[PDB]
Design a protein around this ligand. Structure first.
Ligand SMILES: *[C@@H]1O[C@H](CO)[C@@H](O[C@@H]2O[C@H](CO)[C@@H](O[C@@H]3O[C@H](CO[C@H]4O[C@H](CO[C@H]5O[C@H](CO)[C@@H](O)[C@H](O)[C@@H]5O[C@H]5O[C@H](CO)[C@@H](O)[C@H](O)[C@@H]5O)[C@@H](O)[C@H](O[C@H]5O[C@H](CO)[C@@H](O)[C@H](O)[C@@H]5O[C@H]5O[C@H](CO)[C@@H](O)[C@H](O)[C@@H]5O)[C@@H]4O)[C@@H](O)[C@H](O[C@H]4O[C@H](CO)[C@@H](O)[C@H](O)[C@@H]4O[C@H]4O[C@H](CO)[C@@H](O)[C@H](O)[C@@H]4O[C@H]4O[C@H](CO)[C@@H](O)[C@H](O)[C@@H]4O)[C@@H]3O)[C@H](O)[C@H]2NC(C)=O)[C@H](O)[C@H]1NC(C)=O
Ligand SMILES: *[C@@H]1O[C@H](CO)[C@@H](O[C@@H]2O[C@H](CO)[C@@H](O)[C@H](O)[C@H]2NC(C)=O)[C@H](O)[C@H]1NC(C)=O
Ligand SMILES: OC[C@H]1O[C@H](O)[C@@H](O)[C@@H](O)[C@@H]1O
Ligand SMILES: [Zn+2]
Ligand SMILES: [Zn+2]
Lengths: 937, 935
């Protein structure tokens, strides 16, 4: 028989847009490559190679069929294995619109724990491949699975990508009930207070899930009811299946606006045998349309969106974001804002390093390796997946993520070392030219711990990947107490020696072996500190050879008894608050009689009894470069509070772990900073590191909140920081990794820093969050170390500290080490230098977030304005960058402004119109703008 | 990557022949149509449409890939749904050898409980379709799942089909161990004592199962190890999988002759997503061959056999058959020789009816409907499947089989009625199906056309059609309510009649079963049976008009006590044996301390207790047409022993059921005939109704039997009968349906007639054999006949063959009520389609006569006798086709292969080295000859 599969939409009927899809997690229960090749099916039945193999075969059979695919990490692995004939067929299918890419990033990223730079990076990696191979520009965002949604997702990784729509299944369960009653599941979303309706997007929250209606999952070997329409066979059932379809459509139509609804015909790793789905949908389209009561068609989320836009219809407005997400009264998905803190820091650390690596590679003329096997672009792109950096994957998968990142990091280190060798010489240089250290956090740096030969110095090359001037304390572990530090002009520098401590020494013994395989040499005896001063986008070289604290304007007071913070004050600016800082933990709920929901990798459900709260100072240190207060809170919680020279903030280094759980009680550890500030239930948290959103305790803008979790319901994901304010003071906290934050009482701010549960939370990963480090065999709970940064300012002056320090935290100095005689080094190498015009800086409002060599001589460049319109009187203004002065040693031959993911000419982007309820080479940038360019030299 | 998938065989290496396949049962746990469309997957995950869909897609991708498909019932359903473009692609794939048909019958038939006529019929149905669509002749037989194997399967449904080989997984578990040790899994099999090496076949018993080696099942969503050969991905494992492959190959090579082994790369309903399998096989062929230690290739069973034949090798000989089959110590698969007796009888009845239907349709010029939806050809072909007539399907599937047969039977009944109305009319086709009425529930006394009153001036007209090519006299026995009826022949003479009174057992059956079968309660049980002797020419009709203690009317006499049988003797021939007949039942094992195995639909495992025992005469009847003894053995077992006029045998009618199981004891019911004949552990049973094979109690020719089941291991499948003999007597028993039979003690013969168990036997059907009828449910009751006689040595074979054919092909009765003189005025009361006075020789049966498409007529003649059997009839003979078709003129005649897909003269045979080595149709013993005719 011939089936009428070419149906389109019809004006006077309900139209059911059938959208075939396969939700393909880039790692979760299995690793990425296991998901691809289909191995380890006893863990989960899933093979992406089958999905792409069989979808292509099924699309070829009938030109009216469609399918949407998203995750280029999988698509690219598949593409490279395909014959020239299959590639030709795919080009034909894509050109005809049978295979449409939605999202099109390397992965479907989490929106809570990801930084906007990494979001842009992997989205560009996928989009460039799609543009190059198929001359296609994705128009529909696909966020069907991520656990809540960010403002930046709507306007920046939505509107500004050129997407007309974004689609997602998960919103708060109370919000969903209201949105069904209001028919407000579909909205026009304006995620930027700054850009408003100029960066808006059609946002489609599905009624329930991203699967088909009940009885319309057609995966091979499932117990579905086939449509039997052959009269030569027993038990035809055409009428029954058509009525099944109509019934489900009419139910959806009652909670949806216009005469178009969308069915997401697919689920996790479905379409292993695509024809099993396409057979039934062929028959349903045919027989439903013969019946004619409703209308069915093969469709895509962009065809659906075009239909919704063409309807004469006015749409509800959405502002701000969809955080936090809860799918039940005791199930707030705010635990994963912190889950796997060590992986989250690893991602953030490598993201900064990768930004500097790409700068240096460009300046040194190194060629792109973005699509080579195991490149850092692949590993960091994968790491953005909504089970990866979010921390909601199985342990073995998580280990695989870190293995991939380590491989990419090792390749980046060689690029950085070889580029610095060419660039400082007065590119072919071997990676052996410089050594580098990434284990300063546990005091492990062989290049600086090693004895310096006679008539030689330790050469320290310091590279600054910011477009700003920067001074900064260099802090290296050494074994000689009588070292002299000279700058490049021969001046001896003021140094400070800091003694090794026992907490770090025990970390060093355990973790160096865990990471490298064997025990290191003795815990070095000192840290040597000195202040480096480095040009923007450039380097300097240094030669090394044989109760109250605060060396600058900011001061802290501590109890001499329970050595806890009591006060912060700035002498020069005259801000002064009594403030206490302590460590607590919530006990993880394991459920009860009325609700068995446990706390786990996704969900934070505390017991509801007050968080368990004998600290002592074990050291006070004073010196010209740092004042430090070592605090011991218990045997597994220790902290060093550091006030460094010329730093307008305190650096609070935490060390948490092993979290003891032999007592059978999960523990989720917070730092809490308590003041008497009249914060009036308000607190501010960032969106993917950009806009700050005003959060209000126990309040929701879009629905009348029923309070069920007075703590977990007030946690928000941080990637830059959290701040509060009253009439007199602004209290700001910046993080060094994705972190959950909240204000549970007025004047009080807390960060959740580490979590270990005994139970799984029943959302599919099947594992308690029980991170352990092992060795014969000596296993213990994981220990995390990091910094948070706190400061005080007068109203309207904290903004510039948050933006400036946030960028310095993101992009620290890079240190490169070698041992050579100073005289001979100076005679063969430039010791100070700049790739920009000498004496040029980017404006303090701007950051160079992308500088990267692509194929040919194409260079990708992105500049971001860091401030929102009312943040800083001086910096929240129009500014300019002189690209000629950015690129002093070269001459720009062509400049082309492009879309954020660089797959469109900027001037050719067009926007849909919506009716919404309630309605020289100098680059200018206004607040929050990001501009993207392709250059030729 | 490009994979090197085009490998052939290489001479100096072990060759692994990868044969992709999907074992698709034509009904079993789901119905045929559920298996096809993929519904009810909660019962079993299985969709044949996906198999053919995805296999065609995978073969199209790479011309070196191959796949073999068997069951045309499924292929034909799929074919009718395909587009022109898909049909052309299949034609290309078949023409290229990528898709090869193995077996090619409508199904893969059971070999135990099937009749050779039905095996030929469904096989011709599939082979004609394959030949017509693709111009292909299958060369490899495919019996991978049937539960043991028959002699007729080897020589007739193998060699005589033109197959060079036949392949199967199941043989006896003791026999398999010896064959592994002797490397005699593969043999040259000569299943015919008569034809020997002239009808031989290469028989390949697989090492264990028809699946892949462990770790080489690649079905979508299974937990196999994919071969990961991309170095851009983690965890490449090429070397490991190549070694996995080599290891499995070496193990099989240790028990196989030559440098060629075969992997059956598939299983039940596999290849739902074919590419999952072909991806792995592509990679294995490529990397195994790059490795070079062994050689792998896409192959088929016929390519494999060709390599076995080209090898320098002598092969062990196989004679006779592979029955019975056991897969373990207490697991003889001999229960299904009886299981579902009522379905087995239904199949056998409809087979004989369908033979007569095709005769009459040809004579009346009716058009062929063989490939029409729900035709009897489809229903009877499906019924031969190795879970269908064998009785080993689920109950719901079993009901579906019977539903389909009933649809086909209704269609054939209309063909028979319309055809007879045209053919008996004086001016001879337009006649309506309403012209005649017909009755198929005589067994429960239900025949409205004869029970109803006859109007005045009218007679009950009885047309009697005889589908045998022999003259036949037989007793017509119809249920009537009038005691003063007269029966006149066509000349007007009154015939001798005998009235038999209704009995309570049959009346109790009638009320229940008519309502069950027809949906409505019938009128009062009829008061009498009217009996008269009819005499009909061969392939012709006669017309009759109806209006207003020692027994035996003939030579054969039987003695009973005043109620058990005690003696049979024939005064005229001089045979005389004391013989007792009784009913017993084995108690079904439910497992014991040594072995959990239970008796079930497949496996007969009796309890180890001796069979419990049952008795009184309820009626003795004497008359000129029949003497009868009615016997009640218990409340659920009764019998009528009947000695009819001019019948050289007694006809024993059994009625068994409901078998009571509320006591928790399953029961397997036998009739046992006990004599003092010195049978010396020997007894003879037929092969699919044809050759008789000599069975020896507790003895196996091919291996030294370790006796573990002294009863179940001696059961054999019957489709014609069982007999014994000594120096003085020959004792013969003929069945009316597939039945299990045995001789457990010398001079003793038993039939298993009905079985009801409380447990399943753990071979996959998941159901106790617990048949019930409902409206109110009770265990199923079966009624039927077995036939016994006694003869001098060397003259019982004549009775076996003659009576066997008469049982298979009884008269057809057609009724109408009209005035006798009026009927004779517009109808011929006598007729014959052959020449007047022409008869087929007594040794020959017309087993096929049917109109095909266009003017094409298919004819088959069988010589019924083996060389040893009858001095007069085991001889060369001839049929004159000009006299066979008196009414017509032969324009064209071609002799063809048995399944009519090859010209006979063009068939070629492989040569093997075997250890130990006018239109007149002549027929030698056991020959079957097949012709295509045009008129
Ligand atoms: C003696 O001899 C004989 C010979 O002759 C033998 O044998 C027998 O025979 C007979 C005849 O004669 C037969 O009968 C037949 O049968 C068939 C079959 O049956 C079976 O099956 C069925 C079906 O089944 C199915 O279905 C159901 C429902 O659903 C179920 O249940 C089952 O299970 C199955 O299922 C499956 O399949 C399906 C598909 O197919 C699917 O769907 C599903 O899912 C699954 O899978 C059934 O039903 C039945 O049952 C019944 O019966 C029984 C007994 O047998 C009982 O037990 C039961 O209970 C029942 O009964 C009840 O019910 C009913 C009904 O309601 C009532 O009536 C009663 O009363 C009671 O209550 C069985 O099981 C059949 O088919 C047939 O039938 C037919 O025919 C009649 C007359 O003849 C009538 O009545 C009916 O109705 C029918 O009709 C139809 O068809 C025809 C043709 O055939 C035509 O013509 C007509 O027209 C009609 O049609 C049309 O219409 C319809 C209506 O509806 C429709 O359907 C359509 O569409 C068309 O259009 C008959 O019955 C028998 O079988 C035999 N047997 C054996 C065992 O085989 C004997 O045996 C002897 N006896 C001594 C020896 O004793
Ligand atoms: C099969 O193999 C046998 C074993 O070698 C071959 O027989 C040998 O071949 C020649 C005779 O043709 C002589 O050199 C040997 O005396 C033979 N030996 C035996 C034991 O026969 C045989 O030629 C091969 N081919 C065939 C068709 O038999
Ligand atoms: O008569 C044919 C008819 O038989 C009965 C039903 O089961 C139908 O499905 C089928 O069409
Ligand atoms: Zn997901
Ligand atoms: Zn089978």
């Amino acid at each position: 028989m011939k089936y009428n599969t070419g149906a389109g939409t019809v004006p006077e009927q309900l139209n059911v847009h059938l959208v075939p899809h396969s939700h393909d997690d880039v790692g979760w229960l299995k690793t990425v490559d296991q998901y691809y090749v289909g191995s380890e099916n006893y863990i989960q039945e899933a093979c992406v190679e089958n999905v792409l193999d069989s979808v292509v075969m099924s699309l070829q059979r009938d030109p009216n069929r469609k399918f949407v695919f998203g995750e280029m990490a999988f698509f690219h692995r598949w593409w490279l294995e395909q014959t020239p004939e299959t590639k030709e067929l795919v080009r034909k299918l894509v050109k005809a619109g049978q295979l449409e890419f939605v999202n099109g990033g390397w992965c479907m990223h989490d929106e809570a724990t990801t930084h906007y730079i990494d979001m842009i990076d992997h989205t560009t990696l996928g989009h460039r491949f799609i543009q190059e191979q198929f001359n296609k520009i994705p128009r529909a965002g696909w966020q069907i699975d991520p656990f809540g949604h960010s403002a930046v997702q709507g306007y920046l990784l939505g509107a500004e990508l050129g997407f007309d729509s974004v689609h997602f299944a998960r919103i708060d369960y109370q919000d969903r009930e209201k949105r069904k009653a209001e028919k407000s599941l579909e909205v026009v979303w304006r995620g930027s207070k700054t850009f408003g309706s100029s960066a808006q997007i059609f946002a489609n929250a599905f009624p329930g899930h991203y699967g088909p209606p009940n009885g319309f999952n057609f995966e091979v070997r499932n117990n579905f009811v086939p449509l039997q329409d052959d009269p030569r066979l027993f038990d035809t059932n055409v009428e029954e299946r058509v009525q099944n379809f109509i019934d489900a459509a009419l139910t959806q139509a009652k909670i949806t606006r216009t005469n178009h609804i969308m069915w997401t015909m697919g689920d996790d790793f479905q379409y292993q045998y695509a024809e099993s789905w396409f057979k039934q949908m062929d028959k349903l389209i045919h027989h439903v349309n013969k019946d004619g009561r409703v209308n069915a068609l093969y469709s895509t989320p962009s065809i659906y969106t075009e239909a919704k836009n063409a309807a004469n219809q006015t749409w509800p407005l959405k502002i701000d974001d969809y955080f936090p997400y809860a799918d039940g009264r005791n199930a707030y998905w705010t635990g994963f804002y912190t889950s796997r803190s060590a992986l989250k820091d690893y991602v953030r650390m490598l993201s900064g390093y990768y930004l500097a690596t790409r700068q240096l590679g460009f300046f040194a003329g190194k060629k792109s390796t973005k699509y080579h096997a195991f490149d850092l672009a692949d590993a960091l792109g994968i790491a953005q997946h909504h089970d990866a950096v979010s921390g909601t994957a199985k342990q073995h998968t998580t280990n695989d993520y870190a293995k991939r990142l380590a491989i990419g990091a090792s390749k980046a280190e060689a690029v950085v070392s070889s580029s610095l060798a060419c660039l400082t010489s007065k590119c072919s240089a071997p990676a052996s030219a410089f050594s580098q250290c990434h284990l300063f956090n546990i005091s492990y740096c062989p290049p600086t711990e090693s004895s310096i030969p006679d008539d030689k110095s330790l050469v320290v090359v310091v590279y600054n990947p910011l477009g700003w001037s920067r001074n900064e304390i260099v802090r290296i572990p050494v074994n000689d107490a009588n070292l002299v530090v000279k700058d490049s002009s021969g001046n001896k520098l003021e140094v400070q020696y800091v003694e090794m401590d026992d907490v770090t020494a025990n970390l060093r013994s355990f973790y160096v072996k865990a990471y490298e395989g064997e025990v290191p040499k003795d815990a070095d005896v000192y840290w040597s500190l000195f202040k480096a001063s480095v040009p923007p986008l450039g380097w300097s070289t240094y030669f090394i050879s044989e109760l109250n604290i605060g060396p600058g304007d900011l001061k802290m007071s501590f109890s001499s008894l329970t050595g806890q913070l009591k006060r912060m004050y700035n002498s020069k600016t005259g801000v002064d608050i009594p403030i206490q800082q302590n460590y607590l933990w919530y006990e993880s709920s394991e459920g009860d009689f009325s609700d068995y929901q446990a706390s786990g990798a996704y969900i934070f459900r505390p017991n509801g009894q007050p968080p368990p709260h004998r600290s002592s100072v074990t050291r006070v240190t004073r010196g010209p470069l740092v004042d430090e207060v070592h605090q011991k809170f218990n045997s597994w919680i220790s902290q060093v509070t550091r006030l460094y020279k010329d730093k307008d903030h305190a650096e609070i280094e935490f060390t948490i772990g092993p979290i003891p759980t032999d007592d059978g009680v999960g523990k989720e550890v917070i730092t809490r900073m308590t003041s008497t500030m009249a914060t009036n239930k308000e607190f501010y948290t960032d969106s993917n590191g950009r806009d700050f959103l005003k959060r209000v305790r126990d309040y929701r803008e879009d629905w009348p909140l029923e309070v069920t979790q007075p703590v977990a319901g007030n946690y928000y994901p941080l990637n830059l920081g959290i701040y509060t304010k009253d009439e007199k003071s602004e209290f700001s906290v910046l993080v060094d990794r994705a972190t959950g934050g909240a204000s549970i009482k007025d004047g009080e701010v807390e960060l959740m820093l580490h979590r270990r549960t005994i139970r799984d939370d029943g959302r599919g990963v099947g594992e308690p969050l029980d991170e352990q480090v092992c060795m014969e065999y000596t296993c213990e709970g994981l220990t995390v170390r990091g910094n948070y940064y706190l400061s005080i300012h007068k109203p309207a002056a904290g903004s510039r500290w948050r933006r400036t320090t946030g960028q310095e935290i993101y992009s620290p100095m890079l240190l490169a080490f070698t041992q050579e005689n100073m005289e001979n080094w100076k005679s063969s190498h430039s010791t100070k230098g700049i790739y920009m015009d000498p004496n040029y800086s980017l404006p303090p409002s701007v950051a160079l977030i992308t500088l990267e060599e692509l194929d040919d001589g194409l260079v990708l460049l992105r500049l971001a304005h860091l401030y929102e319109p009312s943040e800083d009187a001086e910096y929240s203004t129009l500014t300019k960058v002189e690209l000629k002065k950015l690129f002093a040693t070269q001459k720009i031959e062509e400049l082309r402004e492009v879309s954020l993911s660089a797959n469109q000419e900027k001037s050719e982007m067009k926007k849909m119109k919506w009716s919404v309820e309630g309605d020289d080479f100098v680059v200018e940038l206004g607040p929050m703008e990001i501009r993207t360019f392709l250059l030729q030299f």
